[PDB]
Every structure is written in C-alpha cells, then in structure tokens.
Curated annotation (Swiss-Prot), chain A:
ATP binds at residues 231-238, 533, 536. It holds the Pfam family Helicase_C_3. The lineage of its organism: Eukaryota, Metazoa, Chordata, Craniata, Vertebrata. Residues 433-584 form the Helicase C-terminal domain. Residues 218-379 form the Helicase ATP-binding domain. A motif (DEVH box) lies at residues 332-335. This is General transcription and DNA repair factor IIH helicase/translocase subunit XPB. Belongs to the helicase family. RAD25/XPB subfamily. It comes from Homo sapiens (Human).
From Swiss-Prot, chain C:
It holds the Pfam family Tfb2_C. GO terms for biological process: DNA repair; nucleotide-excision repair; transcription by RNA polymerase II. The C-terminus (residues 305-462) stimulates the ATPase activity of XPB/ERCC3. Belongs to the TFB2 family. It comes from the Eukaryota. Component of the general transcription and DNA repair factor IIH (TFIIH) core complex, which is involved in general and transcription-coupled nucleotide excision repair (NER) of damaged DNA and, when complexed to CAK, in RNA transcription by RNA polymerase II. In NER, TFIIH acts by opening DNA around the lesion to allow the excision of the damaged oligonucleotide and its replacement by a new DNA fragment. In transcription, TFIIH has an essential role in transcription initiation. Stimulates the ATPase activity of TFIIH subunit XPB/ERCC3. This is General transcription factor IIH subunit 4. Component of the 7-subunit TFIIH core complex composed of XPB/ERCC3, XPD/ERCC2, GTF2H1, GTF2H2, GTF2H3, GTF2H4 and GTF2H5, which is active in NER. The core complex associates with the 3-subunit CDK-activating kinase (CAK) module composed of CCNH/cyclin H, CDK7 and MNAT1 to form the 10-subunit holoenzyme (holo-TFIIH) active in transcription. InterPro entries: Tfb2_C, TFIIH_p52/Tfb2. Keywords: DNA damage, DNA repair, Nucleus, Transcription, Transcription regulation. One of its GO terms (cellular component) is nuclear speck.
Curated annotation (Swiss-Prot), chain D:
The lineage of its organism: Eukaryota, Metazoa, Chordata, Craniata, Vertebrata. The keyword Heme does not apply. This is General transcription factor IIH subunit 5. The gene is GTF2H5. It is linked to Trichothiodystrophy 3, photosensitive: A form of trichothiodystrophy, an autosomal recessive disease characterized by sulfur-deficient brittle hair and multisystem variable abnormalities. The spectrum of clinical features varies from mild disease with only hair involvement to severe disease with cutaneous, neurologic and profound developmental defects. Ichthyosis, intellectual and developmental disabilities, decreased fertility, abnormal characteristics at birth, ocular abnormalities, short stature, and infections are common manifestations. GO terms for cellular component: cytoplasm; nucleolus; nucleoplasm; transcription factor TFIID complex; transcription factor TFIIH core complex; transcription factor TFIIH holo complex. It is found in: Nucleus; Cytoplasm. GO terms for biological process: cellular response to gamma radiation; maturation of SSU-rRNA from tricistronic rRNA transcript (SSU-rRNA, 5.8S rRNA, LSU-rRNA); nucleotide-excision repair; nucleotide-excision repair, preincision complex assembly; transcription by RNA polymerase II; transcription elongation by RNA polymerase I; transcription initiation at RNA polymerase II promoter. Pfam families: Tfb5. The keyword Iron does not apply. Component of the 7-subunit TFIIH core complex composed of XPB/ERCC3, XPD/ERCC2, GTF2H1, GTF2H2, GTF2H3, GTF2H4 and GTF2H5, which is active in NER. The core complex associates with the 3-subunit CDK-activating kinase (CAK) module composed of CCNH/cyclin H, CDK7 and MNAT1 to form the 10-subunit holoenzyme (holo-TFIIH) active in transcription. Keywords: Cytoplasm, Disease variant, DNA damage, DNA repair, Ichthyosis, Nucleus, Phosphoprotein, Transcription, Transcription regulation.
Length: 604, 52, 434, 66
DNA sequence: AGGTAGTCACAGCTGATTGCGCT
DNA sequence: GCGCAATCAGCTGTGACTACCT
C-alpha cells in the first residue's frame, strides 16, 4: 500500500512469523503465493498449491503462484473443503494469512454448488438446491429469454427450469457476473439412459505419475468435470485423452485443428484403446466411413461451424450428430477456442463433459479468461522443469544468438517504415551465414534439424540457396507427408524447412535442433509450440534475430512464457569458427546484389 | 576478390560486439584460469560448436 | 589495493621494523603464494644461503613463470635477500629477524602477544558473541548510513573528515552536510571485508598527518587479526597514540569496549576478517533477499526495481532500465556481479557457477549499451594537397602524442584541442621554411 | 580545418547517423564530414539531441519489462 | 491531448469445378 | 465416355499496422 521505493510493501499486514521459518510459503494480501523449492516439504506444498491455485512462474528456486476465483472453484470442486484449505494455508504461511484472503476465499467458495447445469433428453436445465436463488436471478433480463415458452414454473420434485440451447454461452457468461458460477458434473456411473459403449483400453499402455495425478484430479469423487489439462507435446497428451475416454465409457467426440490431426487421434485410439474400426469414424469429408451409428467420432474445427451451404452427405451427418448426447467431448489445441466461429461449436453440439487439451495456453487478445466459462477451470498445469528432470522430457538448451545488421541493409531498414522492413531483417546476410554455419555443424554432428521460417517469400531464396527440402504450405497433401516421412529414416537428408505449417500439433518426427528465423511478432504460443516440437543436453534450439531491429524486441517479448516455464535463453554473440570455412555471401558484391532482389517486391 | 573477402570479414565479425569485447580482453586477466571448477562449468554451459 | 601492493611501496626500514612482531610475520606469510610458502618453510631451518640455480631447479620448467612471480614477490617484500656467496655465486637466505619471529610464532618462545588477561579476573559486564556481532553490525550500518547522509546516523567529525579525505563525499559549502560521490556508491557496492581493508589502507596512508607510527598500527592490526573471538585482552602496554587508534576502531565497530577508561577490549568478527548469503538469483531476473536491514534494501534497490517487501523477505526484479540508471550513477557491471556473487544464498552455491551465466551476460551487455558511442573532441585536418606533406604532419603529431585518429588513404587526421595550436604553428613554420 | 567531435561506433550506428543527416531529423545538416566507415565528425553544439535520438532508437526495440 | 474496425501477410478448412488416364 | 485426383473460390484464424472522435 505504501510506495516508498515504488514497491507494494506488506510488512505490517502479515507479521505472524511465530517460529520461525519452517513453512516455505509467503502469501500476499491482494493475492499471490511464493513457494521455496529448496524445502523438505516441497513436494507436499507443491501438491497443495496445484490443487488450489495456478502457477504464474516456476523458476529453479522460488515458484510463484496466483490465487484466482476459478482456481478456488476448481479446488472446491475436488473433495477439499473450505475449512481444510484455510487451515492448511494457515499451517504453511510463515507470515500469517492477511485478512483480505480469508474473506476472498470464503466468498469464492460459498457459491459453488448453488447452481448446476444438467443435460437430459437433449434438453438443458439449470437446477438449484436452494429455491430462493431462482427468484434472485429471475429479474435478470438476459436470463428471461432462455425460457420458452416462459417456462411458467417447471414444477419438479429443488427448483429447475429449461434454458435455450443456443443461448447457453450467454447464461454461462452472466452467471459468474452474478456470483453463481455453473458446474459441469457428469455422474457417468449411474445414467441408465445413455447407451454406454464397450470401449476398454489395453492393459499395456502405462502412464506416468503426473498423468495419474491429472486424471485423478479429473475424477475426484467418481464423476467427471469439464476442465483443461496442459501438457507438453513431447509428453503424453493423447494418452491422457484416450484414458479419459475409456474411463468415461460413453460416446466420444474428438475435435482437432488440422485435417491430419484426426488421423493422429485415430492412430492413438487404435493403439491404446482396442476399439473395432466399425465404431471409430472420421468425419472430415474425405472418406465418410459411415459416421452414422458410431461410438467414437473424430473430426476437426472449421467444419462443424460452417455458415455457408454444406454438402448433402455432410448435412445429414450433422443432422444426425445434433440429435443425441455426447460423452466427454474432447477438444485439441484448446488455446485457439475463443474465436469468432470456434466458440459457437460448443453451442452447436450437446455434450456432458468437455475436456480440453493443449500445450501452450498463452494467447493474445486476453481471451483466455473467456475459456474459463467456455469449457471450465484450468485443471492441471504440468511443471516442465521437474518433468525434464525426470528424463522423460528432453532438456533443450535454449539459445538466442543474434547477428549484426550488414551496412548494405541497415540503411534501407532505417529508410523505410511502411511494413516493407520485414524482408530486410528477415534476409540479413549475417543471419543467413549464421544459419548456414549452424546447419553445416549440426549435419556434421548428425542431428535432425527443423528450420522454422515465416514470410515464405524469403524462405524460398533461403532454402533454394542451400538446395534443401522445404514446405511452402500451399503445395499438396502427399508431398508434405512423404517429405516428413522420409525426413526421419534417411541418413542422407536430415534437415527440413517449415513455413508456419508446424505451428500446430502434427506428426513431425523426433529432432534435436530447431532454428527459427523471422517468426510472428509476439506469438508466445507459436514459439512455445515450436519448442514443443523438439522435446520428447539431449537437444537444443536456436533463435536468430537481427540487432537494432524490431526483431530484437519481438524475441524479448515472446520468450517471457518460456522463462515463466523455467527456461533460460543464453545469448550467443560470436560463433566459433565462423571464418574457418567458406559460407555464402562471403563478399560484398552478392550482399549488395541481394538488395535489388529483396526490394523487388514493390507490392503496391 | 581477396581484398573484398578481408573487408567483408572485418565489417561482419567485429561490427558491434567486438570493438569493446576485444579491447576488454586485451585489458583482461591474460594469465591462467582461476580454478579448474570454473573451466568445467564453462565447458558444461558452452554449446558444442563453441567448444571446437 | 591489497596488502602486498601497500607493503611493496614501503621503505626497507619500515619492512624490517614490521618483522619485529611475530604476528606480522605470520600475516605476511599467509599472503604469499602457495609456491612461496613451501620455499619459506623449506628454508626455515637453514643458516646458510642457497644458490639461485639450486632454488630454481626445484620447480619444473613448465611452471617457471609461477616460480619467477613468487621470487619477485619475495624480493619485493624483502622476506629474503640475495647474499654474495663466495665464488661469484649469489646465495639466497631468509631475513634473520623475519625467520626468528616466524619460528617464535610457530614453535614458541618469548612472551605472549598480549600482556595478560586474568590479572583483572572475569569481566563484570562481559557480553556474548551474538551481542558483539549485533554491535558490530549496528556500527557498520550507522557508518554506511552516514555515508548516505540520513539524520539517523550521527558520527564524529573526524570520521566525516576522513571520509571526505577518501574522496567518497565532498563538502561544497561549509556547514551543509556533504554529498556522496560516485566513488562513494562504488565503495558501498564493495564487499564489507574489502570495504574494511580499503578504509584501513586509507587510514595508514593518512596516518602521517596525525603523527602516528605506521609500524605500531600495522603490528597491532595484525595482532587483532589473529585474536580469538569472544576473548578480551589488556589495553595496557600500548602508547597513547595507539589509544586513539583503538578508540577509532571501537567507533568503527571492529573492537568492542564498554568505556574509554576500560582496560578490556573484545575483538569482533569483523576484526578477524580484516586480515582477508541471503540473495537468491533466478533466471527470470528476480532477486529474493532474506534481509530486514534498510542497508541491504538500499544496496539492492540501487541497481534493481523493488517489487515486494515481506517482513523477512525482499522480492526485486533486475530490469534493463534499473541497471542503466545504476551504471549512469557510476557503478560498473563487474561490481554488481561481484556483489551478487558475494551475497549469494547457500542454496545457489550448489550450481556451478553460482550465478547463472545468462544473467551475468545480460548485465554485461546492458553495461555496454551506455558506451556504444565514443566521443572525442578534436580538430580535423583534411586540406592536404600532397601525400608527402600529410605524412610529415602525421609523424609530428604522433611525436607530440596528440593524434586521435588517422586515415592515410584519404589523408585525414584528428588532433586533440590542446595540441591543435602546436600543430598549427608547426604547419605555419613548415610553409614558411619551404 | 574542421573543429568538432570525433564519433566512433559500429557501422550500423554510423549509417543511422547518416540517415539522420540526410532525413534532417535534427532540423539541419550538422553531420558534416564522414571520414571512415566506422568514424564520423560531428559539431559539438548538438551532441545532446544525437544522444536523445540514439537512446530513443535503442529503447524503442527493447521491450522494457518495467 | 490519447485508443479500435479495416487491411495485409500467411496458413488452415471445406464446397464445388476440371483437365488427365484406358488390360 | 466414366472415374480419380489436382485446382480454385470462399470463408476463417493470428498477429501486426493504420486513419478519425471524447
């Protein structure tokens, strides 16, 4: 509250430092938790904090977590009660809980189970234990449109009433503003109305303890609740979804991002679920393997939310699909859920549990907050540092090596400002030489190399100069698949170029070296995804930027997610043996010739 | 040509972060390393292409 | 500056007088290199000089540089002296006084360094080691606050004058409190044992103004260095000049004493360390300090942005702007790195190195940002009609030592403003002589 | 003869100063004489505005975390 | 004296057309 | 002549740059 040095000091607020330091935790009045990792009780404190709060940074020594209303909702969703969490937080405080958190925790946890949402006979109902709250929200104008025709009293038994199916998102957004958040609990143990399927995973696909913890938190009291699980791409992500689908034992719907991720999910199901191919169906307008009458359906976005005319067969498939309940609707790459057309997808299908999986939950436009009510609370957030300490995740040695701007290019860079400077620092001759040197070194040491490069116009001359395979992106489907398939099991070729195509969950093979050049501006999601394509110092990835350009600021502002995850970006300013061998653009003649071909765009 | 190669190398390899780093190295320890532990830590934290 | 640098600049007579105290010889011995100590121990029981070649042959050829450095340091400290061995050879033998005092300090002999301790019996108002440490820390914090200028710190006028003499603070106008200079900030950033030693070296340099014997002060300081913590000694047996020095040390917190007339004095932990962790540093440019005193808070806030201040913790963020401001204040990046390494928490000691390389590299790169542009005032000459004429003027300027930059290809040269007049006069004379 | 201040820097900053000279970003052509690819000669009466411009360029592409 | 819908780049998807192959 | 695969039109997501009102 005091600003003697510009720092919020709370010395007087929390003086309960009785005896004496044995509790490795610090609380903040507004809200924050600081955890000391070098403590004998580190594991238990970490388990307690994960179940109640989401992390904000996990460096090697002092973790920092944040307390949010949705985190407390998730905590109270599990068997943890208000008294237990309060007494255990007071147990490990070392400073005393300020009287702004206990009131906040109490207010958040009081209104959890008052309002519930249920699905029955393809109808959405809102049920409340206390009848008074219904009259409390009756005067709200937005809610009154949901009922039709006005739902005079909907006398049952406990007071509940029907709501408009297509306006469920609006009421979900309103309820949290009304301090009456909705809960999505599916008691699949006793339904007797939904036709459960005979899916059963093979008893040979073992899972790691963190996956066990995530699943156990998903099923806390014998029921499944909608949530989000964040795991690295290299780690086991599809396995968690398959296990959840098997445990739910209901008709499963899987949504992917690309037309190739559906094949990935089908392969995962065929590998770890022992499901006959008749029940498995893929609905992506490619083979149409009779999706009508199926147990497990896999499809992708941008197909369930078409606002234009649809195919005749696809129309009938959608009509059939929108006439029955769904069990554990699984969404992949949940981070790009809050979109103009992707949000309505959850409103176009009916499901009991909505499970979202992703590796990079960070996104711009601050629309991640909407995901709290679109699907549910952030359930699990894996700790990447301890994950790679166990050896199951490759310990990637991050590097941020920059190159000076050549004199023939910096003049043009400072001369132009109307969006024409991207190619100038993208095609820096010094950065080109650094990339070529890294390629040659890691080919001499026999490491698989993936070079990410947006602005495919530059990538053309970047790849044809070295005469190496590249993926333009609008090429074809077979060519990309065959290139990626022969990239792994071929000693002759061990380096590929990707232009914004690998910025999603694909089937790229294991690689040890990743080099990114001229990516998007501040896409922390993109850089985190690119890093995820390497881990699965076993590996290491480099980022090349041009000094005294906007790319420096972009690289600085895009790595904050990874440093929050615990990674450190070493700065490399000199490359050993740069002049030992011959590289391209050795003389100034071709460097100044490059100016004409890089200014030859003239997109006017 | 040969002169162009040398000129380009001089411009590139020592543009911003050498006109001071090289001068500091000329005015640096010069003698042997502090301890063997420092050298081991440096080798561990150095990249494979920087140790050749 | 270290002890060896100060000892090298002393006259031979002062060095000879210093060796008369057994404690001084041990202190000098422990400052020697590892190779030198073995040579001193080998020659401890020798009454005859040894040939220089024989001594040189002890060490292998590959390590001859270290042998030469050790021999040069020993010669500079005058521990041993070259003796004119009969037959044209040069013999090396230790100083007899230094050898005798070292043997007394090691084997034994003579009287104790202190007069006595049980003559007065137990102390009526004896303190404890934690109390002594608290008193020393409070005195040091008071001194450092007086360096800043807070009214809560009140010290003697002589201490303020000494600080002014050290250059840390300047008094532009009499009466008004002095202002701390950039050297004051650099000294504050220094480690406490380094700060104590620098202050003691300044005191020794300025002692001749107060008419105090350098040899006696050095011997007493070295004796205090080897004193046992928590054990008092008799004040008696010292000159009145040494009494003022003892009172000054008591004001500095090195030695505790209940009263000026008291016959007892208790050396503190600072005094023992005069002979020679709470900060956790994270890869995300965050400092977690386990401190409560305002001194460490100010020191950290000098080069970082404060975020949170828990009653027993300080959470700060090391940002580019804060480091740039601190460097503009006069603190170099190397001093900041050394300060962070010294105050490193014991947990960080497991990591090799203790400070993560990325943070140190980023700090050093931030330091280089301020001095990216180099500014050198001067006068440019570009009106050379002939190549030969340019070369002669360039050679004359280099002789005068005023040349800043030269370019023979375009016949361009830059001279210092002070040397511009001389070059102009030379050029005028050359044209007249032509 | 010319009297002023010699400025030594990397070629990128030298070209930035040249662009400032040609674009008249400081209001005049005070960047008179260029001597080397890494050295320039500037009149000393406006070193402050050059420092301000250099600082603005440096911290523009920096993304301070403050 | 200080902030958001068009606009641009680069990818994705699905809905048709549309020339190419033939024991 | 029919059938399969290549191709484009239209719509959308992601991130960043830019011209008029409180």
């Amino acid at each position: 509250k005091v600003d003697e040095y510009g720092a919020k000091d709370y010395r007087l607020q929390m003086p309960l430092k009785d005896d004496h330091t044995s509790r490795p935790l610090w609380v903040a009045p507004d809200g924050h938790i600081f955890l000391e990792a070098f403590s004998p009780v580190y594991k238990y404190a970490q388990d307690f904090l994960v179940a109640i709060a989401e992390p904000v940074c996990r460096p090697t020594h002092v973790h920092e977590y944040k307390l949010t209303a949705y985190s407390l909702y998730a905590a109270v969703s599990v068997g943890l009660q208000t008294s237990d969490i309060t007494e255990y937080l007071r147990k490990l405080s070392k400073t005393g809980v300020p009287d702004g958190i206990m009131q906040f925790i109490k207010l958040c946890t009081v209104s959890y189970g008052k309002v519930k949402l249920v699905l029955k006979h393809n109808r959405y109902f809102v049920e409340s234990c206390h009848p008074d709250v219904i009259q409390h929200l009756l005067q709200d104008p937005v809610i009154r449109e949901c009922r039709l025709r006005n739902s005079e009293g909907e006398a049952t038994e406990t007071v509940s009433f029907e709501v408009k199916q297509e306006m469920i998102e609006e009421l979900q957004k309103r309820c949290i503003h009304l301090e009456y958040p909705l809960l999505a609990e599916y008691d699949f143990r006793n339904d007797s109305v939904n036709p459960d399927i005979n899916i059963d995973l093979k008893p040979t696909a073992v899972l790691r303890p963190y996956q066990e913890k995530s699943l156990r938190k998903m099923f806390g009291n014998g029921r499944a609740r909608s949530g989000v699980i964040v795991l690295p791409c290299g780690a086991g992500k599809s396995l968690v979804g398959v296990t959840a689908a098997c445990t739910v034992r209901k008709r499963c719907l899987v949504l992917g991002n690309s037309a190739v991720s559906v094949e990935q999910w089908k392969a995962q199901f065929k590998m770890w679920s022992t499901i006959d191919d008749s029940q498995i169906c893929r609905f992506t307008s490619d083979a149409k393997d009779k999706p009508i009458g199926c147990s497990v359906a896999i499809s992708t976005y941008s197909m369930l939310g078409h606002t234009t005319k649809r195919s005749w067969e696809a129309e009938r498939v959608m009509e059939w699909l929108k006439t029955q309940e769904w069990g554990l609707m699984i969404l992949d790459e949940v981070h790009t859920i809050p979109a103009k057309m992707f949000r309505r997808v959850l409103t176009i299908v009916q499901a009991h549990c909505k499970l979202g999986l992703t590796a990079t939950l960070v996104r711009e436009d601050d629309k991640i907050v909407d995901l709290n009510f679109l699907i549910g609370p952030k359930l699990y957030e894996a700790n990447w540092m301890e994950l790679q300490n166990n050896g199951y995740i490759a310990k990637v040695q991050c590097a941020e090596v920059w190159c000076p701007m050549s004199p023939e290019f910096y003049r043009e860079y400072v001369a132009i400002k109307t969006k024409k400077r991207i190619l100038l620092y993208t095609m820096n001759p010094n950065k080109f030489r650094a990339c070529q040197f890294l390629i040659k070194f890691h080919e001499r040491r026999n490491d698989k190399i993936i070079v990410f490069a947006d602005n495919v116009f530059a990538l053309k001359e970047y790849a044809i100069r070295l005469n190496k395979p590249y993926i333009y992106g609008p090429t074809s489907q077979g060519e990309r698949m065959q290139i990626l398939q022969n990239f792994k099991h071929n000693p002759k070729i061990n380096t590929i170029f990707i232009s914004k195509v690998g910025d999603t969950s694909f089937d790229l093979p294991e690689a040890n070296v990743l080099i990114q050049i001229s990516s998007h501006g501040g896409s922390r999601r993109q850089e985190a995804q690119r890093l995820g394509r390497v881990l699965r110092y076993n590996a290491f990835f480099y980022s090349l930027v041009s000094q005294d350009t906007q790319e420096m600021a972009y690289s600085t502002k895009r790595q904050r997610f990874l440093v929050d995850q615990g990674y450190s970006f070493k700065v490399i300013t000199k490359l050993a043996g740069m002049e030992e061998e011959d590289l391209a653009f050795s003389t100034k003649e071709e460097q100044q010739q490059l100016l004409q071909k890089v200014l030859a765009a003239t997109d006017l | 040509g040969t002169s162009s190669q040398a000129e380009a190398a001089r411009i590139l390899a020592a543009s911003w972060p050498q006109n001071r780093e090289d001068e500091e190295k000329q005015k640096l320890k010069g003698g042997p390393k502090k301890t063997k532990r420092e050298k081991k830590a440096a080798a561990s934290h150095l990249f494979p292409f920087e140790k050749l | 500056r270290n002890l060896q640098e100060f000892l090298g600049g002393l006259s031979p007579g002062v060095l000879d007088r210093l060796y008369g105290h057994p404690a001084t010889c041990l202190a000098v011995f422990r400052e020697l290199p590892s190779l030198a100590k073995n040579w001193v121990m080998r020659m401890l029981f020798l009454e005859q000089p040894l040939p220089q070649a024989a001594v040189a042959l002890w060490v292998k050829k590959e390590f001859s540089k270290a042998q030469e450095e050790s021999t040069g340091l020993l010669s500079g400290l005058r521990i041993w002296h070259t003796q004119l061995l009969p037959g044209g050879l040069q013999g090396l033998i230790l100083n007899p006084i230094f050898r005798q005092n070292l043997r007394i300090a090691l084997l034994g002999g003579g009287k104790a360094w202190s007069d006595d301790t049980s003559q007065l019996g137990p102390d009526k108002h004896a303190r404890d080691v934690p109390s002594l440490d608290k008193y020393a820390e409070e005195r040091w914090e008071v001194v450092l606050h007086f360096m800043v200028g807070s009214p809560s710190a009140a010290v003697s006028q002589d201490l303020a004058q000494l600080l002014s003499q050290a250059g840390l603070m300047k008094s532009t106008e009499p009466g008004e409190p002095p202002c701390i200079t950039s050297a004051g900030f650099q000294f504050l950033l220094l480690d406490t044992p380094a700060q104590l030693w620098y202050f003691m070296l300044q005191y020794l340099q300025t002692a001749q103004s107060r008419g105090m014997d350098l040899v006696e002060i050095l011997s007493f300081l070295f004796q205090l260095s080897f004193s046992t913590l928590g054990k008092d000694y008799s004040v008696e047996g010292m000159s009145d000049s040494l009494l003022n020095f003892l009172q000054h040390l008591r004001e500095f917190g090195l030695v505790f004493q209940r009263k000026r007339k008291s016959r007892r004095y208790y050396p503190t932990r600072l005094a023992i360390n005069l002979s020679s962790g709470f900060i956790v540093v994270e890869t995300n440019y965050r400092l977690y300090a386990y401190t409560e005193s305002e001194l460490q808070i100010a020191l950290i806030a000098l080069f970082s942005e404060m975020l949170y201040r828990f009653p027993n913790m300080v959470v700060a963020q090391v940002t580019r702007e804060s480091v740039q401001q601190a460097i503009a204040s006069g603190i170099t990046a190397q001093q900041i790195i050394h300060f962070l390494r010294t105050r490193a928490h014991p947990v960080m000691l497991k990591q090799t190195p203790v400070l993560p390389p990325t943070i140190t590299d980023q700090i050093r790169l931030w330091e280089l940002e301020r001095d990216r542009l180099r500014f050198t005032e001067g006068v440019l000459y570009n009106q050379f009609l002939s190549q030969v004429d340019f070369e002669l003027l360039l050679a004359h300027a280099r002789e005068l030592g005023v040349l800043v930059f030269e370019n023979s290809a375009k016949r361009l040269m830059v001279v210092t403003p002070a040397g511009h007049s001389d070059v102009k006069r030379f050029w005028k004379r050359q044209k007249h002589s032509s | 003869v010319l009297k002023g201040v010699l400025i030594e820097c990397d070629p990128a900053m030298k070209q930035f100063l040249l662009y400032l000279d040609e674009s008249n970003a400081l209001g005049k052509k005070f960047i008179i004489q260029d001597i080397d690819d890494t050295h320039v000669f500037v009149i000393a009466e406006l070193v402050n505005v050059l420092q301000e411009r250099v600082g603005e360029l440096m911290d523009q592409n920096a993304f301070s975390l403050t």
